[PDB]
Design a protein around this ligand. Structure first.
Ligand SMILES: [Fe+3]
Ligand SMILES: [Fe+3]
Lengths: 515, 387, 168
């Protein structure tokens, strides 16, 4: 009554509220996902982390305070933003912004999954991921924001959201980390984002990114991405629960391993070579060959352990896993060829492997020296680094029959005459348009699904235009309006200008005209 | 221990020799080229703006070409087909609160921790002893409980918005608005769970509240509106407008502020105002951002303003009628409460409705050129007040 | 030959000239449908403006959508295609078409064509999106059945490509 009440101090803990969450949803005929899908996520699917809105915020705010303390107080006092090796400081312009678009699109992908789920707990797991991917978007931004303030070359750290549009390396990133996350069956997007991008690739990504960064004097990136890792553990649990939620739908047995095989090939096709390249070539000090990192996490831990436990819900190991393992050894070296050859279309300053780097490459990738090593040394000899040389190696490739093609599906560059990786050129004409495909899995995707894969490539956009005009149009210059953001060396002097590019006369051809 | 280039002598020396003795550019403002909304470019705009990789054929985008991978059939990753409204730049929107992820979770974390200290102390105080028992058990537990399903339904209407919408700042506004709505629903349940610890026999199960939400006439109008805004449409601007600017600003404001918060301070309820304080704080934060999107950016677009106001007026006409009927159904709850002159009598409900509709006319209707006769709306709803 | 700049060129400019002459909803509807049939999807009639058609499409959309709000009664914005057809009737027609499709090649062309003909502003956004989602569900179910059953050699003949080069 009005005089006697239990006055023990009590609150309400998150899991006390969370146990009633499933009952917040109610039945009505129109309570059904809006997105096209072959699958139905089960009504009673639970989630693993019993988090409510207030507990989510408390959790993450506490992570932020630690992270921002380290960055804005301690690392600034140390001057650590300019104690990064230039090779690595340049590589983070690309690594952080490319990863940022994967964080950003993962907000939209997680919302789409939230829409596909019918159980309130499953919607809630995806919602927590929606919020985290906003956090991660702004964390990647904050890396490049901080470099822009404290590192000796802010250009490209300070404008990648527009300067990325100049180059072909960004197109491939959009497939794996943007479009591959949000365009298709929500379940296909889930295996792209959660079962593969997160449960397969986010552990090796974070371990490698933070280990390569700290090896090269970068303590900004470990501070952020070690915080990102704590969130990403929960997202792998979302990918697991997507497979659980559809396990008893008969459509799962018809379709799921097709979506997973396609998604795994999609992710590995670019994620494998682009990170391998950015790590080993954008570094001075070497940590562990990317191939070993890929083997341990992708082949053994994910393809073995993760995929194995998922057999309880009908998951098979991807048929394209063998082909992807052969790619993991050479495909990033192949990509390095194109990335160095087309350096003026990027937004980072590049360094050819020195003698120590070449010994490292040859010792861990025996065969590198006689092939890539000879090529890189020839380019250096021809004036790769020298702004008076009129030399850009993309033109050397053309002169010597080493044509560059773009996979219509993955946007990954392909140089068949020099590639040691998996893959082979197929050139088809369909309805008055020529298409280059570069592997059995993507070619199947294009032949069955031609309307999903209509991306214009850089040779089609830039055909017959001169390189310096393309760069200037795309704002690929420093604040003086003439010096390039991108450079073929990491020294403080003899930086290339639009005029030095124009001297070379690089004009884009149509690589398929000959077929 | 692993070697670190910051502290390892050999590597620190190699790095120091490699670092040039001067900056290679003086432009240190991250994404300097964003057009600032206010006097100086803000951290909020730097971290958020142009994260979305739109091409030039989605208004405002900086990229080019088709998407790399589209839906079966050809639906683009993001496309102009996603909404009826049109603008010269989808990136124009700015949250006046300037919320990127960090300040957003920082503020809600304060509320998260302070709430539990409050509850531990309120239970220690014994302050529940003075609540009107009829209010506590027959009105608050049942009908405030049932109201969580409005907040929850409004939360879920955002799922397709988060997927479909066309810019980064808009995406941030919608996702934070969504979390705040499911927060409201979870806080209503937290309050009921809390009381169940202080009042023996008080049932905090959602059974009866859900029964009320799904079948009681008092909520059938609101439920029909919520079901339509959530699962009936996919135009993500329609969802945002109908959700926050019409339904939640009329029905939801009346239910939360004029009924449960106001009448709590008429029936001796020292607890519920702590919880409605948070939902109403979230309402005003959400309103600032909704207002900027639909008023500043869309209704006043230099090329498509008249166009967009045509659709906004048509949506408002429709969703206002739905909300008026929701309130007509709802004010039948007054027949269940103890009479309090000036609060629960017909005059009192009239003034409550005049505030809600009067404020709405100022806050929303007049800004898009939607004509509304406040007395007509008040009288329409009051027709549901029992004699 | 030589491409013009990405965002400002004579092709985009010439098409904006044509778009400005559109003065009625019927005329603009015929224009955008002829445009999408001629220049969008893998079954387009022409790739001549491949790198400009998507932006040009956006401008046609903006013109037709403004003509709709200026010319049509508000109810027609909600219920009708700008063809004058009832939007729910179009949805019914096309959902039924794709459900009677007998192969993935049949279904894909029904779905693509529905988008070329009825993409907003022609069809109301809400009707269009739920029709597109229903069609996509059916197209995926048929495409993703026995997805690896046909060898690449056979898939090429089914798709009808002209094979110009196969490496190695
Ligand atoms: Fe993430
Ligand atoms: Fe994630």
């Amino acid at each position: 009554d009005a005089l006697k009440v239990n006055r023990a101090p009590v609150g309400v803990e998150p899991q006390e509220v969370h146990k009633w969450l499933q009952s917040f949803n109610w039945d009505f005929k129109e309570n059904r996902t809006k997105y096209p899908t072959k699958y139905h996520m089960a009504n009673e699917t639970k989630e693993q982390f019993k988090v409510i809105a207030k507990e989510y915020a408390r959790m993450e705010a506490a992570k932020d305070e630690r992270q921002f303390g380290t960055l804005l107080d301690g690392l600034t006092r140390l001057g650590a933003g300019n104690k990064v090796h230039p090779r690595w400081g340049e590589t983070m312009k690309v690594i952080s912004n490319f990863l940022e678009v994967g964080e950003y699109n993962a907000i939209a992908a997680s919302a789409m999954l939230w829409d596909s789920a019918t159980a309130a707990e499953q919607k809630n797991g995806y919602l927590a991921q929606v919020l985290d991917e906003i956090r991660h978007t702004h964390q990647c931004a904050f890396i490049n924001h901080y470099y822009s303030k404290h590192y000796h070359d802010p250009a490209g750290h300070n404008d990648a959201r527009r300067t990325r549009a100049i180059g072909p390396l960004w197109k491939g990133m959009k497939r794996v980390f943007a479009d591959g996350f949000i365009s298709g069956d929500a379940v296909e997007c889930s295996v792209n984002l959660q079962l593969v991008g997160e449960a397969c690739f986010t552990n090796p990504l974070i371990v490698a990114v933070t280990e390569w960064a700290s090896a090269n004097g970068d303590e900004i990136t470990p501070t952020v991405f070690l915080s990102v890792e704590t969130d990403e553990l929960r997202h792998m649990a979302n990918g697991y629960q997507t497979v659980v939620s559809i396990a008893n739908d008969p459509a799962s047995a018809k379709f799921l391993n097709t979506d997973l095989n396609n998604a795994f090939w999609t992710q590995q096709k670019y994620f494998t070579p682009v990170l391998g390249y950015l790590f080993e070539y954008g570094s001075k000090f070497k940590v562990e060959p990317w191939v070993k990192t890929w083997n341990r996490w992708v082949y053994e831990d994910w393809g073995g352990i993760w995929i194995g436990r998922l057999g309880k819900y009908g998951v098979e190991s991807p048929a394209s896993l063998r082909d992807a393992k052969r790619d993991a050894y050479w495909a990033h070296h192949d990509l390095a060829l194109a990335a160095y050859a087309m350096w003026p279309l990027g937004f980072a300053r590049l360094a050819l492997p020195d003698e120590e780097d070449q010994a490292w490459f040859e010792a861990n990738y025996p065969g590198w020296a006689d092939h890539y090593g000879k090529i890189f040394n020839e380019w250096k000899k021809l004036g790769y680094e020298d702004p008076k040389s009129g030399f850009i190696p993309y033109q050397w490739l053309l002169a010597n029959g080493h044509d560059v093609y773009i996979d219509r599906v993955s946007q990954v560059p392909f140089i068949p005459s020099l590639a040691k990786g998996t893959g082979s050129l197929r050139v088809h004409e369909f309805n008055g348009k020529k298409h280059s495909l570069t592997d059995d899995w993507g070619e199947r995707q294009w032949l069955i699904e031609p309307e999903r894969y209509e991306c214009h490539n850089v040779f089609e956009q830039y055909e017959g235009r001169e390189l310096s005009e393309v760069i200037a149009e795309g704002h690929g210059v420093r604040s003086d309006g003439k010096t390039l953001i991108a450079q073929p060396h990491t020294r403080g002097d003899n930086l290339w200008t639009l005029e030095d590019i124009k001297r070379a006369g690089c004009v884009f051809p149509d690589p398929l005209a000959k077929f | 221990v692993t070697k670190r280039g910051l502290t390892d002598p050999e590597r620190a020396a190699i790095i120091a020799a490699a670092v040039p003795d001067h900056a290679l550019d003086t432009q240190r403002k991250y994404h300097y080229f964003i057009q600032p909304r206010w006097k100086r470019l803000s951290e909020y705009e730097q971290l958020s703006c142009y994260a979305q990789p739109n091409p030039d054929w989605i208004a405002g985008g900086l990229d080019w070409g088709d998407w790399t991978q589209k839906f079966h059939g050809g639906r683009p990753s993001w496309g102009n087909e996603s909404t009826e409204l049109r603008t010269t730049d989808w990136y124009r929107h700015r949250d006046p609160a300037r919320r990127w992820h960090h300040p957003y979770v920082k503020d809600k974390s304060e509320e998260a921790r302070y709430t539990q200290r409050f509850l531990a102390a309120y239970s220690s105080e014994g302050s529940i002893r003075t609540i009107d028992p009829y209010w506590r058990d027959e009105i608050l537990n049942k009908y405030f409980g049932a109201l969580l399903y409005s907040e929850y339904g409004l939360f879920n209407a955002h799922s397709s918005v988060g997927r479909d919408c066309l810019s980064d700042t808009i995406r941030q506004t919608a996702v934070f608005a969504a979390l705040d709505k499911v927060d409201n629903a979870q806080m209503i349940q937290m309050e009921r769970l809390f009381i169940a610890k202080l009042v023996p026999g008080f049932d905090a199960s959602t059974d009866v509240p859900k029964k009320i939400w799904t079948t009681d006439p008092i909520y059938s109008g609101a439920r029909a509106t919520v079901q339509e805004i959530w699962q009936g449409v996919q135009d993500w601007n329609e969802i945002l407008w109908a959700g926050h600017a019409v339904y939640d600003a009329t029905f939801g404001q009346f239910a939360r502020r004029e009924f449960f918060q106001r009448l709590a301070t008429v029936y001796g309820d020292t607890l519920t105002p702590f919880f409605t304080a948070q939902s109403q704080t979230y309402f005003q934060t959400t309103r600032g951002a909704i207002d900027d999107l639909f008023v500043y950016c869309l209704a006043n677009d230099s090329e498509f303003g008249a166009h967009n106001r045509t659709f906004l007026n048509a949506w408002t006409e429709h969703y206002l009628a739905s909300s008026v009927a929701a309130l007509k159904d709802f004010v039948g709850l007054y027949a269940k409460v103890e009479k309090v002159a000036g609060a629960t009598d017909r005059a009192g409900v009239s003034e409550a409705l005049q505030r809600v509709f009067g404020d709405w006319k100022i806050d929303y209707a007049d800004k898009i050129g939607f004509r509304v006769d406040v007395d007509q709306k008040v009288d329409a709803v009051l027709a549901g007040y029992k004699n | 030959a030589k491409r013009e700049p990405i965002h400002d060129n004579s092709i985009r400019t010439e098409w904006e000239a044509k778009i400005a002459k559109l003065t009625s909803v019927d005329q603009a509807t015929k224009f955008i449908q002829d445009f999408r049939l001629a220049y969008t999807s893998p079954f387009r009639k022409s790739y001549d403006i491949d790198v400009d058609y998507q932006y040009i499409e956006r401008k046609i959309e903006e013109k037709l959508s403004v003509l709709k709000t200026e010319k049509l009664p508000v109810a027609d914005l909600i219920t009708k295609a700008t063809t004058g057809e009832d939007a729910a009737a179009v949805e019914a027609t096309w959902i039924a078409k794709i459900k009677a499709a007998k192969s993935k090649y049949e279904a894909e062309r029904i779905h693509i064509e529905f988008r070329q003909l009825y993409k907003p502003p022609v069809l109301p956004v809400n009707v269009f999106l739920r029709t597109d989602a229903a069609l996509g569900t059916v197209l995926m179910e048929i495409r993703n059945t026995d997805y690896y059953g046909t060898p690449l050699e056979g898939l090429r003949k089914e798709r009808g490509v002209k094979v110009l080069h196969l490496q190695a």
